[PDB]
Coordinates of C-alpha atoms and ligand atoms in Angstrom, one line a residue:
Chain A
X1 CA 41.7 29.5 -70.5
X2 CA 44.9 32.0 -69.4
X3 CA 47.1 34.3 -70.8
X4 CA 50.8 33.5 -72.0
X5 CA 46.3 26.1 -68.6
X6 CA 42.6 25.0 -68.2
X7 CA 42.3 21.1 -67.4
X8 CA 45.8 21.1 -66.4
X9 CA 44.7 23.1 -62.9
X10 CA 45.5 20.3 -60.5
X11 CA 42.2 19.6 -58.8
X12 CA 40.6 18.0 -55.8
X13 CA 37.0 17.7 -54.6
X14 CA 35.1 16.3 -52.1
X15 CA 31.8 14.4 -52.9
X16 CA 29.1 13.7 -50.5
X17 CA 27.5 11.5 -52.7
X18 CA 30.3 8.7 -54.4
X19 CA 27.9 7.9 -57.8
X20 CA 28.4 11.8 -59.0
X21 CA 32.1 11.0 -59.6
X22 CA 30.8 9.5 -63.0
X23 CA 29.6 13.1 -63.9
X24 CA 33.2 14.7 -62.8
X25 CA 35.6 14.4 -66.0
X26 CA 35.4 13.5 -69.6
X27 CA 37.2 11.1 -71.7
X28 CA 37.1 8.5 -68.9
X29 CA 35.5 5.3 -70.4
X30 CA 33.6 4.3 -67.1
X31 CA 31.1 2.3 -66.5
X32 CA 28.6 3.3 -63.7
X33 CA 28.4 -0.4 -62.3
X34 CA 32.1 0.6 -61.4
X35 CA 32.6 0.8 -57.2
X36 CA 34.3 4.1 -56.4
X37 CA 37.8 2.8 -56.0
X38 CA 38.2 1.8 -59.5
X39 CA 36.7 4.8 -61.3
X40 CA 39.3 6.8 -62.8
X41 CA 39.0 10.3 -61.0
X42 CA 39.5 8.5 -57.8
X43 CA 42.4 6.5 -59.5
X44 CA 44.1 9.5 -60.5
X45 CA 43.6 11.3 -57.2
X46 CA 41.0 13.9 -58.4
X47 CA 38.1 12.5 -56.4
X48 CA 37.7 11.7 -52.9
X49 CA 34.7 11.0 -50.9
X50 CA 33.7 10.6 -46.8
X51 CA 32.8 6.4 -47.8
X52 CA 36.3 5.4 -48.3
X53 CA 36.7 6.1 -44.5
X54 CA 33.9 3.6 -43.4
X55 CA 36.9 0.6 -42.5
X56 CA 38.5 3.6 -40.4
X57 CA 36.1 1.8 -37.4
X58 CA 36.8 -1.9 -38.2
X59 CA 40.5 -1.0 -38.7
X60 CA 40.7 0.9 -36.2
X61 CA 39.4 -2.1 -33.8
X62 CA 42.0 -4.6 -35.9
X63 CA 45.5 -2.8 -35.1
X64 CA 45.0 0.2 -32.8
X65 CA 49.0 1.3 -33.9
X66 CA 47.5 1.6 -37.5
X67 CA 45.0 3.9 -37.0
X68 CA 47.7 6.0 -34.6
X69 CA 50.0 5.9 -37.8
X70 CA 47.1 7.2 -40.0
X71 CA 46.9 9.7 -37.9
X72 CA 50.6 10.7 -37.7
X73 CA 50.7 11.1 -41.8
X74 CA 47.8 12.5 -42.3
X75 CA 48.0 15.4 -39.7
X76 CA 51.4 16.3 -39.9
X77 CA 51.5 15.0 -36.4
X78 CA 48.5 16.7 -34.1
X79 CA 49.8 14.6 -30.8
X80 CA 47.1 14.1 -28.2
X81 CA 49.2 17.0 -26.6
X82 CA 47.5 19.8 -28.9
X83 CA 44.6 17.8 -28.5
X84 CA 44.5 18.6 -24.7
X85 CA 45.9 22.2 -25.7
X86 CA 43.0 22.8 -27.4
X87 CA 40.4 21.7 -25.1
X88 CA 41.2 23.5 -22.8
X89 CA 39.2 26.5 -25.1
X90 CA 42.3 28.8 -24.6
X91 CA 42.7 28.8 -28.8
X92 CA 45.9 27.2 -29.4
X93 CA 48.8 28.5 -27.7
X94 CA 52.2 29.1 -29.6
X95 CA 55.8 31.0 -29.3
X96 CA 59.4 30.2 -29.3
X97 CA 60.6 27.5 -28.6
X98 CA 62.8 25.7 -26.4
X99 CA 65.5 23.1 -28.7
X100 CA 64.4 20.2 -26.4
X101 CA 61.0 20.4 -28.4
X102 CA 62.0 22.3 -31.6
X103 CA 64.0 19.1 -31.7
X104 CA 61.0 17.5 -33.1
X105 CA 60.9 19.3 -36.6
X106 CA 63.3 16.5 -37.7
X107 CA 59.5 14.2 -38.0
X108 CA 59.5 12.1 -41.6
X109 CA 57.6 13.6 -44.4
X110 CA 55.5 12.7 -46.9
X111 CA 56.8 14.4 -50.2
X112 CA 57.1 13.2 -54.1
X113 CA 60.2 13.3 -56.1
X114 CA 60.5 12.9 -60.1
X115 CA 62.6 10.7 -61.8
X116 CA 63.1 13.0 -64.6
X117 CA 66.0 14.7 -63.8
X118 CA 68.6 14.9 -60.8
X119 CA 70.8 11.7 -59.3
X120 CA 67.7 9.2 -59.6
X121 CA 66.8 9.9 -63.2
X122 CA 69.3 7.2 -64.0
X123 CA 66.6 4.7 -63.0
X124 CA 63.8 6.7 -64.5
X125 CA 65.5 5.4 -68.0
X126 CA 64.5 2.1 -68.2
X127 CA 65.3 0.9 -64.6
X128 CA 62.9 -1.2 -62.1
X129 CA 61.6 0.0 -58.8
X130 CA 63.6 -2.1 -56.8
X131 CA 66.9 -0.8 -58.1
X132 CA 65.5 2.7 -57.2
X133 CA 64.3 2.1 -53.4
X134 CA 67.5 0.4 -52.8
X135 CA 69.6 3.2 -54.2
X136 CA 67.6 5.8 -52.7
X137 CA 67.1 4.7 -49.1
X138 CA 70.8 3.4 -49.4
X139 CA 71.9 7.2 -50.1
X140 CA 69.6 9.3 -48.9
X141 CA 67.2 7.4 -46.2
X142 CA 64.3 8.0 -48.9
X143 CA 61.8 5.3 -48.4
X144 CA 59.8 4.6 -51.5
X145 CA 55.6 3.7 -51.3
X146 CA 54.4 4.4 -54.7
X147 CA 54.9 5.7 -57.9
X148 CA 52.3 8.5 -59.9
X149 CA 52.4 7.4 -63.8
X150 CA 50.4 9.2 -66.7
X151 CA 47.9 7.1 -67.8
X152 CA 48.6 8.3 -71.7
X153 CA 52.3 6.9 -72.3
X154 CA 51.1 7.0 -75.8
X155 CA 47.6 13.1 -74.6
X156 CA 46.3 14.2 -70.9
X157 CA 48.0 14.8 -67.7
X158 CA 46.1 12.5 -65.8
X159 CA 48.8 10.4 -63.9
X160 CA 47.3 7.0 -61.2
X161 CA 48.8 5.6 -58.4
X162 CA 50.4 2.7 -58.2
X163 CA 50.8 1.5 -54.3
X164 CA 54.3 -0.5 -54.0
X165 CA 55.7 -2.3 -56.9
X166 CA 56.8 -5.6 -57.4
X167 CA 60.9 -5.5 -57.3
X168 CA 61.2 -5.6 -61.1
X169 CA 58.2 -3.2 -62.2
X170 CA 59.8 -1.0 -65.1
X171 CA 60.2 2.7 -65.0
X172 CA 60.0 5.9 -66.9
X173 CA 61.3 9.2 -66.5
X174 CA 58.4 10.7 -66.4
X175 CA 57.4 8.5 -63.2
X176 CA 56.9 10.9 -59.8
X177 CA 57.6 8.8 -56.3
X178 CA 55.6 9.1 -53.1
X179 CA 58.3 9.1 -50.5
X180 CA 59.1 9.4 -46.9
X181 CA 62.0 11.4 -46.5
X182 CA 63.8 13.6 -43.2
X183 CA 64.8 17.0 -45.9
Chain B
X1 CA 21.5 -16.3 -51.9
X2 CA 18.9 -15.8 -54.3
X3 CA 16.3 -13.9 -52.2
X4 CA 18.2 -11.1 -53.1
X5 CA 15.5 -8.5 -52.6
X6 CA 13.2 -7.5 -49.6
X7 CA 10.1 -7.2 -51.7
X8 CA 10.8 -10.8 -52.7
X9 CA 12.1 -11.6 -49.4
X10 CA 8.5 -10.6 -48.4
X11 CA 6.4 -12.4 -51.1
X12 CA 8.1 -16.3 -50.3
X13 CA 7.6 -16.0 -46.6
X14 CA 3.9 -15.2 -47.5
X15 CA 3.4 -17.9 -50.2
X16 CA 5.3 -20.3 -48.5
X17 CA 3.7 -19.5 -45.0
X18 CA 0.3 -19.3 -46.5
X19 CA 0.5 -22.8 -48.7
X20 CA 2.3 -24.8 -45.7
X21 CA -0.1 -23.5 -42.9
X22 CA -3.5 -23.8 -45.6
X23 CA -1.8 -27.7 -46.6
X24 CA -1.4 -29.3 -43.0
X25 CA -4.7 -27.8 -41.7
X26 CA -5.9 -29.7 -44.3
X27 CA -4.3 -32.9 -42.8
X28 CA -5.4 -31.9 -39.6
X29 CA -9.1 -31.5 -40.5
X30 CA -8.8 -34.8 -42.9
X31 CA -7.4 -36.6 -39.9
X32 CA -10.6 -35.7 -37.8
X33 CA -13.5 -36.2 -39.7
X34 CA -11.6 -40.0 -41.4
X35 CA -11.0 -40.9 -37.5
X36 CA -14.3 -39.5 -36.2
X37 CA -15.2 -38.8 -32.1
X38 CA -12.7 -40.7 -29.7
X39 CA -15.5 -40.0 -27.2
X40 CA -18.4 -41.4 -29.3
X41 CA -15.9 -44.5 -29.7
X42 CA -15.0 -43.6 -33.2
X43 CA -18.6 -43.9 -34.3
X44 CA -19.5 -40.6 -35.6
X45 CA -16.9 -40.4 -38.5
X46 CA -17.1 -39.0 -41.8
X47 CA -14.7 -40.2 -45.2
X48 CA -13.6 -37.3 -47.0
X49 CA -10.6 -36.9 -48.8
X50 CA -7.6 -35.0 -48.1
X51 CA -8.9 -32.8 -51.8
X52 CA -12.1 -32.7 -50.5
X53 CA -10.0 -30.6 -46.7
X54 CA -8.7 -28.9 -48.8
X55 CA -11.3 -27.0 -51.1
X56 CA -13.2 -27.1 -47.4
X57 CA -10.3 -25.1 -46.0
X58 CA -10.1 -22.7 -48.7
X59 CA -13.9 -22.2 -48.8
X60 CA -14.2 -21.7 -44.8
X61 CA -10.9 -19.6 -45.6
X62 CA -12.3 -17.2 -47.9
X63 CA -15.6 -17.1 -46.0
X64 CA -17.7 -18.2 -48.8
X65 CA -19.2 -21.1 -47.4
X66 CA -20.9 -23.2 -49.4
X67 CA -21.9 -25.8 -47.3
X68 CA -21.5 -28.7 -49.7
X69 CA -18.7 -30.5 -47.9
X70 CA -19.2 -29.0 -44.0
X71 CA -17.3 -30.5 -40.6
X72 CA -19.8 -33.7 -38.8
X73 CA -17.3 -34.8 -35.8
X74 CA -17.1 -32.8 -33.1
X75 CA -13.2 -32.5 -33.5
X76 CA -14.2 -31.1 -36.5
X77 CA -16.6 -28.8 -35.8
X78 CA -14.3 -27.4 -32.9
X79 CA -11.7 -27.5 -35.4
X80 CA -12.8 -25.3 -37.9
X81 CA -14.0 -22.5 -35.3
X82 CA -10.8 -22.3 -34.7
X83 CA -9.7 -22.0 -38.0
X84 CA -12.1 -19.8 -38.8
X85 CA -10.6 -17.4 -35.8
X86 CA -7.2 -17.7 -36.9
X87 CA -7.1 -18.2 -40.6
X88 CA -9.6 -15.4 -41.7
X89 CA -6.8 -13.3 -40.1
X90 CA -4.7 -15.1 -42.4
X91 CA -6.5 -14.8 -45.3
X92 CA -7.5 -11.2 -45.5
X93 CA -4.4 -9.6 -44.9
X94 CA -2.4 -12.2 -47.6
X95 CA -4.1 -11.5 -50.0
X96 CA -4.3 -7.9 -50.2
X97 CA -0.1 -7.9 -49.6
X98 CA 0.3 -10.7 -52.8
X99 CA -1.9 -8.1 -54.6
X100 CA 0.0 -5.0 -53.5
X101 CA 3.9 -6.7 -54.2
X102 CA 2.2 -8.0 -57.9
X103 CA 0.8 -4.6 -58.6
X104 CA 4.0 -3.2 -57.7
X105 CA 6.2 -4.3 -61.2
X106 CA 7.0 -1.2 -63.5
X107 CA 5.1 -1.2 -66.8
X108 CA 7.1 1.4 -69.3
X109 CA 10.7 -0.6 -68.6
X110 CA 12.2 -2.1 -71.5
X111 CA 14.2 -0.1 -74.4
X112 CA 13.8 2.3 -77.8
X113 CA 13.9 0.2 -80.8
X114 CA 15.6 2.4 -83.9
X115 CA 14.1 1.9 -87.1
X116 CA 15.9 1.9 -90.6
X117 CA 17.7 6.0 -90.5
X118 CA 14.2 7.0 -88.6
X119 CA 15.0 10.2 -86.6
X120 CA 14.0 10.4 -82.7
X121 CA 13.8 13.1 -79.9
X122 CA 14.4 12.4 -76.4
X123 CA 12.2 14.4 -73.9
X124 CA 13.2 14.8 -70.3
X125 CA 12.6 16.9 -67.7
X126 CA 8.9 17.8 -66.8
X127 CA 6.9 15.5 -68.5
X128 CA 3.4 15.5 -67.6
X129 CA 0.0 15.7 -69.6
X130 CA 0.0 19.0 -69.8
X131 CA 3.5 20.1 -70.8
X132 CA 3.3 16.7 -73.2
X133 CA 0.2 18.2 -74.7
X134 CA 1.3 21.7 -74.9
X135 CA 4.4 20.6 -76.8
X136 CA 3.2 17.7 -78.8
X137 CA 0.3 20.3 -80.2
X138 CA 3.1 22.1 -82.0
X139 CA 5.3 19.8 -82.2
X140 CA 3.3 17.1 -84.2
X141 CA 1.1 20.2 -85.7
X142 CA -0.7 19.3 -89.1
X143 CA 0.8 22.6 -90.6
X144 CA 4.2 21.8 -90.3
X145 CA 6.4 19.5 -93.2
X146 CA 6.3 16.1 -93.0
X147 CA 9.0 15.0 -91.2
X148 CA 9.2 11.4 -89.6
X149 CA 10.8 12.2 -86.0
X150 CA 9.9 10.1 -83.3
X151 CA 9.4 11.5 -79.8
X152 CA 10.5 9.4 -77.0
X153 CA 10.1 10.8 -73.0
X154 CA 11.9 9.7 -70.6
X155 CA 10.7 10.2 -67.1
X156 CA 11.0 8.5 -63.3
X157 CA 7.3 9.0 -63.2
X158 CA 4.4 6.2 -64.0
X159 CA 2.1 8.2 -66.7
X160 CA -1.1 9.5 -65.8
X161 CA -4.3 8.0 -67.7
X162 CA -4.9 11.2 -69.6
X163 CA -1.2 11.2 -70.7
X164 CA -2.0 6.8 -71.7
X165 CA -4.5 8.2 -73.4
X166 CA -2.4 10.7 -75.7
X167 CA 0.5 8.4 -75.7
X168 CA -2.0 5.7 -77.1
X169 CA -3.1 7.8 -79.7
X170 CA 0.4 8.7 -81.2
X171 CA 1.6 5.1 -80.5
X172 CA 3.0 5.0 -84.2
X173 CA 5.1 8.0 -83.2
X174 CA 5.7 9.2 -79.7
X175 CA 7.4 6.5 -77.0
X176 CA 7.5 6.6 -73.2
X177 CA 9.9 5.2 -70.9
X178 CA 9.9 4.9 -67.1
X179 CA 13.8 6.3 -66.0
X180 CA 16.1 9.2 -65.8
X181 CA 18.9 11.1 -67.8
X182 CA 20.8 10.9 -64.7
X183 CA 21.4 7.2 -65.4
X184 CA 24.0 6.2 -68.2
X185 CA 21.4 3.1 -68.4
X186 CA 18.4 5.3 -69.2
X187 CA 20.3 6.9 -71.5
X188 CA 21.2 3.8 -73.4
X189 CA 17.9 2.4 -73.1
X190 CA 16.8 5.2 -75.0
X191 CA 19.4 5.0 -77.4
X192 CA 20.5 8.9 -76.7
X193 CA 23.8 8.7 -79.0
X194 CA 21.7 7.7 -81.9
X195 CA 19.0 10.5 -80.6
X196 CA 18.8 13.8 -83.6
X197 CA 18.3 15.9 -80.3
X198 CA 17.5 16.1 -76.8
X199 CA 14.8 18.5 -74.9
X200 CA 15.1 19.4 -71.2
X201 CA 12.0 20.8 -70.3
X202 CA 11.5 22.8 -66.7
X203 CA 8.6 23.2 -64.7
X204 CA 7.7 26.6 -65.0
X205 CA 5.7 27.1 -61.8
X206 CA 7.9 25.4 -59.6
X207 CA 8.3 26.8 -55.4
X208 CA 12.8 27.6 -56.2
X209 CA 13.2 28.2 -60.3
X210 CA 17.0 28.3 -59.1
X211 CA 16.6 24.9 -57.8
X212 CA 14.8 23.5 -61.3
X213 CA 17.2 25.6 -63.2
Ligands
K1 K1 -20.8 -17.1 -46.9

C-alpha cells in the first residue's frame, strides 16, 4: 500500500514451472486441469512461461519468414548485422551516425492506443472494430491486431487480449488497441 | 487409445505375451504326444487332451512337477526340454513383474466423508509417526474438553506400520489420505473449505530450515 496502488502495479513474471501460475493471483476461478493458455494470468498478460516457445522449432521449420518476423517485433530489430557486431567480442560498437543508416529509425512499432479519448474515441462509443481499423489505417497508417478489455465490464483492472476481431465485434471506450504504427 | 499408461502398457504385453505363448505350446505339445513318433511310424503315441497340455505346461512351467501327466513320444520329450529352457525364463521373471505392477496401486486414495456439523482438522506438512504421535498425545489428551474434532493428514507419503497402527486405533477419529496441499484436488478430497482449521507442520531437524520454512 502507498501514500496519496497495490494490485494495480502492472506486473509480469516469468515461471519456470507453467502449473505454479494457479498459485499466482486471487479471485480467478481456475481450474487446475486448465492448459496454460487459457488460465487467466496468462490471458490477461501477467504470466508468461519458456513452454509457450516449444512451436518456435516446428514453426520455425514451417515458414522460415515467420520466425524472421518474430524476430523483427520482438527485438526491436537486432539484424544479423549486430549479430556479427557482436561476435566479433569487441562489445557492441556505437556513435553518430551517418542519415543513410539513421534512415532506419522510421522501422514500425508495436505500441497501444486507447479508445477513451482523442479522434478514435468516437468508435470506442458503441462502434465495431472494423469501423475503427478502417478509419485508423485510412488516416493515420495505424494497423490494428488486437484489443486489451477489462474482464469486469460490470471491479478489477485485469484487462485480456483479444487477437483480431471479427469486422462487427462491439467496442467500448475503455478498450486499449495493439497497434502497428510509424510515430 | 486406451493403453493410456506405461505401467499398463507394461502389464497387457506381459499377460497377453505370457497367455498366448503358455496356450499354443500347449497345442504344440498336444499335437505331439496325439500324433506320436513319425520315426517309430506313429506307433508310440499318447491321447491327452489339449486341458490335460495345458495343466502339463503350467506344471513343467512352475517347476513343480508332478509327474502325473509326463511327455511319452520322443517329440515330446525333446519338446518339453526345450520348454523347460525357455519358459522357466519366462515364468520366473513374469510373475515377480505382475506381482510388483499389482502391488504398485495406492491404498489411502479416496476422499473425507463430513458428518452431520462434525468439526475436522487437516494436517499437512511432516507427518510421520513421530510427529503424529507427539501431536495426537496432546491433541486427543484425556484432560482436555470433550470436543468432537476429527483429525484428517494429508501426506504424499504411504504410512509406516507403526503410524497404521495408531491410525487404526483412532479410526473413529483421526483420517489419513495419500496427497498434497499443493494440489487443488487434495485439497477437495479432503474437503479443506468445510475444514475448522488447518496445521502445517515442519520438520524440525531438517539439513536447510530456510528451505522447509
Ligand atoms: K519339482
Amino acid at each position: 500500500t502507498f501514500d496519496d496502488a497495490g494490485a494495480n502495479v502492472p506486473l509480469i513474471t516469468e515461471l519456470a514451472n507453467d502449473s505454479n501460475v494457479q498459485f499466482l493471483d486471487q479471485d480467478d476461478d481456475d481450474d487446475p486441469d486448465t492448459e496454460l493458455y487459457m488460465t487467466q494470468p496468462f490471458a490477461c498478460g501477467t504470466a508468461f512461461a519458456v513452454s509457450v516457445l516449444d512451436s518456435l522449432m516446428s514453426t520455425s521449420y514451417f515458414n522460415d519468414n515467420a520466425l524472421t518476423l518474430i524476430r523483427t517485433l520482438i527485438t526491436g530489430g537486432a539484424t544479423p548485422e549486430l549479430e556479427q557486431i557482436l561476435a566479433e567480442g569487441a562489445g557492441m560498437r556505437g556513435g553518430y551516425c551517418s542519415p543513410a543508416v539513421l534512415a532506419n529509425r522510421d522501422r514500425c512499432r508495436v505500441a497501444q492506443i486507447s479508445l477513451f479519448d482523442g479522434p478514435l474515441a468516437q468508435f470506442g462509443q458503441g462502434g465495431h472494430y472494423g469501423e475503427l481499423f478502417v478509419y485508423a489505417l485510412r488516416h493515420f497508417g495505424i494497423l490494428c491486431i488486437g484489443l486489451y478489455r477489462f474482464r469486469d465490464t460490470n471491479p478489477s483492472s485485469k484487462r485480456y487480449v483479444i487477437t483480431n476481431p471479427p469486422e462487427d465485434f462491439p467496442l467500448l471506450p475503455t478498450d486499449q488497441v495493439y497497434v502497428l504504427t510509424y510515430k | 487409445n486406451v493403453l493410456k499408461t506405461s505401467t499398463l502398457i507394461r502389464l497387457v504385453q506381459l499377460v497377453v505375451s505370457f497367455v498366448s505363448l503358455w496356450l499354443t505350446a500347449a497345442g504344440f505339445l498336444h499335437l505331439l504326444e496325439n500324433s506320436g513318433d513319425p520315426f517309430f511310424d506313429f506307433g508310440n503315441a499318447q491321447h491327452l487332451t489339449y486341458w490335460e497340455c495345458l495343466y502339463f505346461l503350467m506344471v513343467t512351467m512352475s517347476t513343480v512337477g508332478f509327474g502325473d501327466i509326463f511327455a511319452t513320444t520322443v517329440l515330446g520329450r525333446t519338446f518339453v526340454v526345450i520348454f523347460i529352457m525357455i519358459f522357466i525364463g519366462l515364468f520366473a521373471s513374469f510373475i515377480p513383474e505382475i506381482a510388483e505392477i499389482l502391488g504398485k496401486r495406492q491404498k489411502y486414495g479416496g476422499s473425507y466423508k463430513k458428518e452431520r456439523g462434525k468439526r475436522h482438522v487437516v494436517v499437512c506438512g511432516y507427518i510421520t509417526f513421530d510427529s503424529v504421535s507427539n501431536f495426537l498425545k496432546d491433541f486427543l489428551h484425556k484432560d482436555r474438553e470433550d470436543v468432537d474434532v476429527e483429525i484428517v493428514f494429508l501426506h504424499k507419503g504411504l504410512p509406516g506400520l507403526e503410524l497404521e497402527g495408531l491410525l487404526k486405533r483412532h479410526f473413529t477419529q483421526v483420517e489419513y489420505f495419500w496427497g498434497s496441499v499443493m494440489d487443488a484436488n487434495d485439497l477437495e478430497r479432503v474437503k479443506i473449505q468445510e475444514a475448522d482449521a488447518c496445521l502445517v507442520l515442519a520438520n524440525k531437524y531438517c539439513q536447510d530450515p530456510d528451505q522447509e520454512d
